[PDB]
Amino acid sequence: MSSDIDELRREIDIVDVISEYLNLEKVGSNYRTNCPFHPDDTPSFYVSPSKQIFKCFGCGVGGDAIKFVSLYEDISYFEAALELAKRYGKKLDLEKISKDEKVYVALDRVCDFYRESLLKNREASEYVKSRGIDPKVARKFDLGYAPSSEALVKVLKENDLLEAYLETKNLLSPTKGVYRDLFLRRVVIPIKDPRGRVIGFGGRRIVEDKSPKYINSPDSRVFKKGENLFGLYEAKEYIKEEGFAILVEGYFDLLRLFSEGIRNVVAPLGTALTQNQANLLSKFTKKVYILYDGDDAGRKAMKSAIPLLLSAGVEVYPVYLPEGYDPDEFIKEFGKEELRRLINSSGELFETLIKTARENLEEKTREFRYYLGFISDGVRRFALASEFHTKYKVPMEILLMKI
Ligand SMILES: [Zn+2]
């Protein structure tokens, strides 16, 4: 399509805009300086020419060039947009700004509100920390806290973003023109699309309540839980570099592995892996290690997810935690490096079936022939069938499910 704001963003170079305000030192391909928004001793505020964003490793504030100006000048995102449009000789009529654009800006402003709120609340902050999440990871992932509906509503109204935000359904209305934050009182975990745009939130409750321990934004135009993976934006460069991804069950397992420097990690949004999520993962990698809880249900969840991964053409390597351990407890007892080793020592699905079918030929043949049926590569399919046939003498027509 065609929009003033998108055209403005394309024309701006974040390096030129921030350099007007700050003394930027070139460090590698990036620039760094001391943060103007929080106070620390050592320059922690980075500007990436290649990503066209800034990010403070000290307080976690981050965003594009317009957003920097908004924060520096204490004005709204679109107010900052207008100021930059004048500097660049680009048009921007604030009346032509689509609601659509405002939704994303609202999502992002609400993310900043929650982040600030987490820093200010001692119980929430200590909670997150007490759970083994590193403060550096908490900041990278823009973790927050929802302290007040009225506080949130005030920032929305002040920024002229309330009506846009209402399209997300992250706000309830119990009575006319009064609002309650869906995530009230929860530690907030922003959900980003694969390009890093905040599209919604998960919320983990930290108080005793009748409500679910975890909730997500409801599905909508902007947010589809079944089509996104938590951590993909943060993980994708590590996944590419390492040549595989690690799939864990939920956000807390992911945040923990990232806290321990294991960064090529994704998790299903909210729940069980979906086919769309397996398809999406396959666009970044063709090898996935699955690391679910070391109990029955975890093992059963790995078995449900494997055919979705196979169908998407990924090679699967199940990682078996010892009985009773989730990733968090395993890391606490044995250390991050042992988890890396466990993951590495884990055999590929079919190679492991072939190796262990000896245990229970009957049950293991069942599994093998079942998983085999999700391989779209017939050449590979056949070689796997041949190996099993050769080894255990099970007829090719049993293995290929020929009726
Ligand atoms: Zn900062």
Q: What letter does residue 185 receive in the DSSP assignment?
A: T
What are the residue ranges of CATH 3.90.980.10 in the chain? 98-224
What are the residue ranges of CATH 3.90.580.10 in the chain? 1-97
Q: Is 249 annotated as a binding residue?
A: yes
What are the tokens at 26? 């070139």
Q: Ligand 1: distance of its center to the CA of 94 in Å?
A: 29
What are the residue ranges of CATH 1.20.50.30 in the chain? 349-403
**Looking at domain 1-97, which CATH architecture does it have?**
Alpha-Beta Complex (3.90)
Q: Is 13 annotated as a binding residue?
A: no
Q: Ligand 1: distance of its center to the CA of 205 in Å?
A: 27
What are the tokens at 403? 């009726």
Evaluated on CA atoms 153, 197, 279, 256, the torsion sign reads negative
The closest alpha carbon to 393, from 383, 385, 401, 402, belongs to: 385
**Angle of the 327-334 helix axis to the 336-345 helix axis, nearest 10:** 120
CA gap 303, 31 in Å, rounded: 46
The closest alpha carbon to 235, from 262, 209, 212, belongs to: 262
Q: Which residue has the tokens 């309830």?
A: 172
What is the SS3 assignment for 28? Answer: coil
- Protein residues within 5 Å, CB atom, of ion ligand 1: 35, 37-38, 56, 58-59
CA gap 273, 248 in Å, rounded: 10
What is each CA distance from 364 to 42, 301, 350, 369, 388, in whole angstroms?
58, 18, 11, 9, 11
The closest alpha carbon to 195, from 119, 262, 127, 108, belongs to: 108
Tell me, rounded to whole angstroms, the distance of Cα 207 from its chain centroid: 24
The closest alpha carbon to 47, from 66, 33, 60, 37, belongs to: 33
CA gap 248, 114 in Å, rounded: 25
What are the tokens at 166? 């209402």
What is the phi/psi pair of residue 32, to 5°?
Answer: -140, 160
Q: Ligand 1: distance of its center to the CA of 140 in Å?
A: 12
The DSSP H or E segment spanning 139 is: helix 135-140
Q: Ligand 1: distance of its center to the CA of 261 in Å?
A: 22
Q: Which residue has the tokens 């590495």?
A: 344
Tell me, rounded to whole angstroms, the distance of Cα 170 from its chain centroid: 18
Q: Ligand 1: distance of its center to the CA of 262 in Å?
A: 25
What are the tokens at 126? 């200590």
Q: Ligand 1: distance of its center to the CA of 18 in Å?
A: 14
Find out whether 229 and 269 touch, Cβ atoms under 8 Å.
Answer: yes
Residues in contact with 17: Cβ distance below 8 Å, sequence separation at least 6, in sequence order: 65, 68, 69, 84
The closest alpha carbon to 87, from 2, 18, 7, 17, belongs to: 17
Strand 171-172 vs strand 144-145: parallel, antiparallel, or unpaired? unpaired
What are the tokens at 258? 């990232």
Q: Ligand 1: distance of its center to the CA of 32 in Å?
A: 11
Q: Ligand 1: distance of its center to the CA of 59 in Å?
A: 4
Angle at 327 between CA 60 and CA 261, to 5 degrees: 40
Q: Ligand 1: distance of its center to the CA of 43 in Å?
A: 9
Evaluated on CA atoms 395, 398, 400, 403, the torsion sign reads positive
Q: Ligand 1: distance of its center to the CA of 46 in Å?
A: 9
Q: Ligand 1: distance of its center to the CA of 137 in Å?
A: 15
What is each CA distance from 181 to 142, 143, 145, 200, 277, in whole angstroms?
18, 16, 11, 13, 28
CATH code at 225-348: 3.40.1360.10
CA gap 207, 217 in Å, rounded: 19
> Which CATH fold topology does 98-224 show?
DNA primase DNAg catalytic core, N-terminal domain (3.90.980)
Domain 349-403 belongs in CATH node 1.20.50.30 = yes
What are the tokens at 132? 């083994």
Report resolution in angstroms.
2.0
Question: In this structure, what is the dihedral angle of CA atoms 378, 382, 383, 389, given to the nearest 10 degrees?
Answer: 160
Q: Ligand 1: distance of its center to the CA of 175 in Å?
A: 38
